[PDB]
A paper describes a structure:
[name] [name] is a di-iron protein of the widespread Repair of Iron Centers proteins (RIC) family that has the capacity to donate iron, which is a crucial component of the biogenesis of the ubiquitous family of iron-sulfur proteins. Bacterial [name] are composed by an N-terminal ScdA-like domain and a C-terminal domain that folds as a four-helix bundle where a histidine/carboxylate di-iron type center is inserted. In [name] [name], the best studied RIC protein, the center is coordinated by H84, H129, H160, H204, and two μ-carboxylate bridges formed by E133 and E208. We show that [name] establishes protein-protein interactions with the scaffold IscU, where the transient cluster is formed, and the cysteine desulfurase IscS.
Crystals of [name] [name] could only be obtained when the proteins contained the mutation to alanine of the two vicinal cysteines C30 and C31 (designated YtfEM), a result that agrees with previous reports. The structure of [name] YtfEM contains two channels. One channel is mainly hydrophobic (which will not be addressed in this study), and a second hydrophilic channel that connects the metal center to the solvent. The di-iron center is located ca. 10 Å below the channel entrance, which is approximately circular in shape with a diameter of ∼2.3 Å. The channel is formed mainly by hydrophilic residues, namely H160 and H129 (that are also Fe ligands), K132, E159, E125, and E162. The three negatively charged glutamates are located at the channel entrance and solvent exposed suggesting a possible iron exit. In YtfEM, hydrogen bonds occur between residues D5 and R17, E49, and R86. Analysis of the electrostatic potential on the molecular surface of [name] YtfEM shows that domain A is mainly positively charged and domain B is mainly negatively charged. In addition, the cavity where the di-iron center is inserted is positively charged, and the negative charge at the surface in this region is mainly due to residues E125, E159, and E162. Besides these coordinating ligands, an oxo-bridge between the iron atoms is also present in [name].
Residue numbers in the entry: 2 to 220
Amino acid sequence: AYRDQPLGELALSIPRASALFRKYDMDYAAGGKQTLARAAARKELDVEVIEAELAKLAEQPIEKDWRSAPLAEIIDHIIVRYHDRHREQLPELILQATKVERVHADKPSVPKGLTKYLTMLHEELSSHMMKEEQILFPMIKQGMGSQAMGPISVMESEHDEAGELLEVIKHTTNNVTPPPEACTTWKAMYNGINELIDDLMDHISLENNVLFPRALAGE
Ligand SMILES: [Fe+3]
Ligand SMILES: [Fe+3]
Ligand SMILES: [O]
């Protein structure tokens, strides 16, 4: 039956199901409405195995269920858990990528263009998060969420733009897998990239699958 539920609900309801979908490159963040059945079919995956993996994870409940939490507490959580972290993590990654592309400019496995793409992500995320905090989030706190179809659609479009950059970043880095040649700086940067991708998809998932639809519905 898990195959008939949307990816978003499985990610928000089952602990560490988010990490499972990232293992299968399944987009529970922007494509959260997509059922697990239609997602496993797209990628030619054996859905029955995914269902058993979720069944094991589903033995335990999730630490915090945001699906029914107050919108104000979701917003405040997003700001300190995701927005503020992104502002610290991306400048750090940009400088690491700059150091790696130079130090290992001669290796074949070096991720050329990574610094360019991290910079693009940082600029778009920065402007994006400012708009949410200065325009959309206050609108929702004042109870005007039902009148926010316009702004939310613009934010969800930007969420898609950010998703495309993530895919470019994953390709440039062999799905964020360092080569055997990788030094310590090189390996720690990829660990930071994976941490960014994980947070950003949970960040977008929480907005697209909970905050936005519930605001539009008048909660
Ligand atoms: Fe956000
Ligand atoms: Fe956002
Ligand atoms: O965001």
